[PDB]
Structure formats: C-alpha cells, structure tokens
C-alpha cells in the first residue's frame, strides 16, 4: 500500500498529529483516503476525514461515492492493507485493527476489485 500522503508528510509529524487528534476527538477516528494506483475514478481533493467510530463502511462508501460524483452504475471498492473491508464493519473497528504507527487509518478507493490493477 503506497500513499502519496505518506510521501508528502514525514512520519514523525504524522505521528504527532495522530496522537493529538485521537486525544481531542476520542469518539472519531482519523482516516486518510486516496485513489488506488491505476484506478479510473475521479480525484478526491479532501484526503483527511475525522469519522465517527460508529459509522459503517457502507455509510462511508455512500459519502465517498457522492464526493467523487459517481454515476449509479459506477462501482466503488475500498482497500485497507490490500484487503476489501466488510461493508458491515464500523470504521472504529477498522481503525482498531488496521491503523498504522502514526495512529492514522489509510483507505484506498478504486473502480477495480483488486488493489492496483
């Protein structure tokens, strides 16, 4: 999983921000969202989302679909650590199981069901 956000912001600063934002908003989780490599989907200008821990993956799909103006017939897949997360999972559960060492959760989105194809 390569994220441009991690190229743009050194780890030491990401970790400091993640620690502070979890203390400030403990009922939310910090999520970095980016297009998967070679996905044919519109860009997402906003990459930083503070998501209620109880929000479902399905609710988050609905939000991102709207933000990138998908047509009804367009597909959308999420990837976390190279795997599609269950639609019924909460974002807090995904965070607990997959956050990186900077305390952020990284989600890639794509029109393909295989990451980076």
């Amino acid at each position: 999983m390569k994220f441009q956000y991690k190229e743009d912001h050194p780890f030491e600063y990401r970790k400091k921000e993640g620690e502070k934002i979890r203390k400030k908003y403990p009922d939310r989780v910090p999520v970095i969202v980016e297009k998967a490599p070679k996905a044919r989907v519109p860009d997402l200008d906003k990459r930083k989302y503070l998501v209620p821990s109880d929000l479902t993956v399905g609710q988050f799909y609905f939000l991102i679909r709207k933000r990138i103006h998908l047509r009804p017939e367009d597909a959308l897949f999420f990837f976390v650590n190279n795997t599609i997360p269950p639609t019924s999972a909460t974002m807090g559960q995904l965070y607990e199981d997959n956050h990186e060492e900077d305390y952020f959760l990284y989600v890639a989105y794509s029109d393909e069901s295989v990451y980076g194809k």
């Binding site: 910090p30 989302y49 799909y61």
Partner: peptide
C-alpha cells in the same frame, strides 16, 4: 490541511 468532520448516522442506500 483540515480534517473533514463527517456527520453521524448518514444514508447508505
């Protein structure tokens, strides 16, 4: 940049 504050209990279809 700033965090987007996502609202609770939104739609899903």
């Amino acid at each position: 940049e700033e965090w987007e504050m996502v609202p609770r209990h939104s739609g899903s279809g």
